From a paper:
Here we show that TLNRD1 is an α-helical protein structurally homologous to talin R7R8. Increasing TLNRD1 expression enhances filopodia formation and cell migration on 2D substrates, while TLNRD1 down-regulation has the opposite effect.
The first 40 residues of TLNRD1-FL are not visible in the density, supporting the secondary structure prediction that the N-terminal region is unstructured. However, the structure of TLNRD1 revealed that the putative actin-binding surfaces on α2 and α3 are positioned facing away from the dimer interface, raising the possibility that TLNRD1 might engage two actin filaments simultaneously, and thus cross-link and bundle actin. However, a notable feature of the TLNRD1-FL structure is that the five-helix bundle packs against the side of the four-helix bundle. The structural information from equivalent talin complexes was used to model the RIAM- and KANK-binding sites onto the TLNRD1-FL structure.
Author numbering:
A (entry chain A): 40 to 343
B (entry chain B): 39 to 342
The structure:
């Protein structure tokens, strides 16, 4: 049951390390219709939440309340994710607010989001593959099936929009065909997930693994097609000052993420021999690291 | 180039005729749909005659240097050997079950041999779409690939429809349908790309065709994999030792024929480098021998 904490202090780590796909590259709006000031306020809120959750998870671990610590981590991960996205967006807005800037131009789809969705679909199917039978509980399968259901819902909407925005016949129809393929694959798999749920057996499980391939491939093909170079639009064109302004904020946000990562590993570290815990300083140092990182983050938002 | 066009055939033929030996190893099942032993034997006689003819034809046509003709002769030889193989297998089954204490085979929801072949051919087609460089992707090759895939997919669809009907399980009954839907949508998605790379050739379109190949292969693999689950497979015939002997004989003879024609293919393949200076016309002549004698064995083990 303490294992359930190593789990989180890992899926969380990867969840928050994946998001640094916004911290390296060009300048694009990392969000949907918000202004810089509001965004910075959001970041402030997140950092507050971060202080709170840092303390909470710390004390909850040091109490021996692992089940709570886990959820606290989950929330911390989600919070760091949000903070990262907002940081990226604020960096972009600050960048384009600069004198001679030209704004970015949207692709047919949001690359970052669909990339995330592909990653999540692959993760879900991986979970269906790597889970042993008796461990495939009716709740786990429902969670996986629900996660696949959102991801597919988002991809479907995105590709619908992309189809609409397309002014070429082939692309317009290809998006639709790809969507149909994706949906049928999904249905086929989810049937198997329901079957292995109601009538568990090794056959049904291997079946669930069998019908995972078509969905992963479908989504990979659709996303691959959706991100063809001519569909990608354009990153913003900004002066050196803009890029500096953006680099700063991205730096701070990266500081936060890295600090929280080190904290996560430190949480995972003591989850073997807690009573002994010869490494009590390492854990405590990351509260500080995170706090200072948050300070940098706040520093580069008020100045630029 | 035109002798170049012959490596292709003297290879796809070999694999086409070596793949069909999926009827030459295993248990005893009807390898055809509703024919009697005598008629089957007659068919085999006809095939062997045709085989003698085509043996000569391809031999002389090569030794004349008329390669384009030799190629087509090979193709027809391949098709003929395939037919002979199927008939031989069926005759072996019929002879086996004609034995005193035999119990006949019982059909699975689908014909394993055919769907296996179809999966193999879909994979082959998609492989061809992947490994062909642009401009070698001629408007005829794409049409050929497309029609092949369409032919295999039509068969798979009909078979799985029948399987859905014959199913006595709700889940299986529905799963066949879902799998078919998935297969068809994937197919459509891919064939669209095949049409695009044909009308508007480019590297993008080509890589696209390769991109949209995965979902179809996986769809077919999942559907075929599911269709051949152990509880769907039915039963092989239960025959005495004499029956099995009787079958072993015929399968042996037919295997002799196939192996001989394989070696002949290789001998034809051998001389397509230095025809003017090829000391091994004897290797080539010997396979006439092997094939003829093999045909004799085949006929021998058919009379009893």
């Amino acid at each position: 049951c303490k294992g359930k904490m190593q789990l989180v202090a890992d899926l969380l780590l990867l969840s928050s390390e994946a998001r640094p796909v916004l911290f390296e590259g060009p300048a694009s709006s990392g969000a949907g219709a918000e202004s810089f000031e509001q965004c910075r306020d959001t970041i402030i809120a997140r950092t507050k939440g971060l202080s709170i959750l840092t303390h909470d998870v710390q004390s909850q671990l040091n109490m021996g309340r692992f089940g709570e610590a886990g959820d606290s981590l989950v929330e911390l991960g989600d919070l760091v994710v949000s903070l990262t996205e907002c940081s990226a967006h604020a960096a972009y807005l600050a960048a384009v607010a600069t004198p001679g800037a030209q704004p970015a131009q949207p692709g047919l789809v949001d690359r970052y989001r669909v990339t995330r969705c592909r990653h999540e679909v692959e993760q879900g199917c991986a979970v269906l593959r790597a889970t042993p039978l008796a461990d495939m509980t009716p709740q786990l399968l429902l969670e996986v099936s629900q996660g696949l259901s959102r991801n597919l819902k988002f991809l479907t909407d995105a590709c619908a929009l992309a189809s609409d925005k397309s002014r070429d016949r082939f692309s317009r129809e290809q998006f639709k065909l790809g969507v149909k393929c994706m949906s049928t694959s999904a249905s086929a798999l989810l049937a198997c997930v329901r079957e292995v749920k109601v009538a568990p057996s090794e056959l049904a499980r291997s079946r669930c693994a069998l019908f995972s391939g078509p969905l992963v491939q479908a989504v990979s093909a659709l996303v691959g097609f959706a991100t063809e170079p001519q569909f990608l639009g354009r990153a913003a064109a900004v002066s050196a000052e803009g890029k500096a302004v953006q680099t700063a904020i991205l730096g701070g946000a990266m500081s936060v993420v890295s600090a929280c990562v080190l904290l996560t590993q430190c949480l995972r570290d003591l989850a073997q021999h807690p009573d002994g815990g010869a490494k009590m300083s390492d854990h405590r140092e990351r509260l500080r690291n995170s706090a200072c990182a948050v300070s940098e983050g706040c520093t580069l938002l008020s100045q630029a």
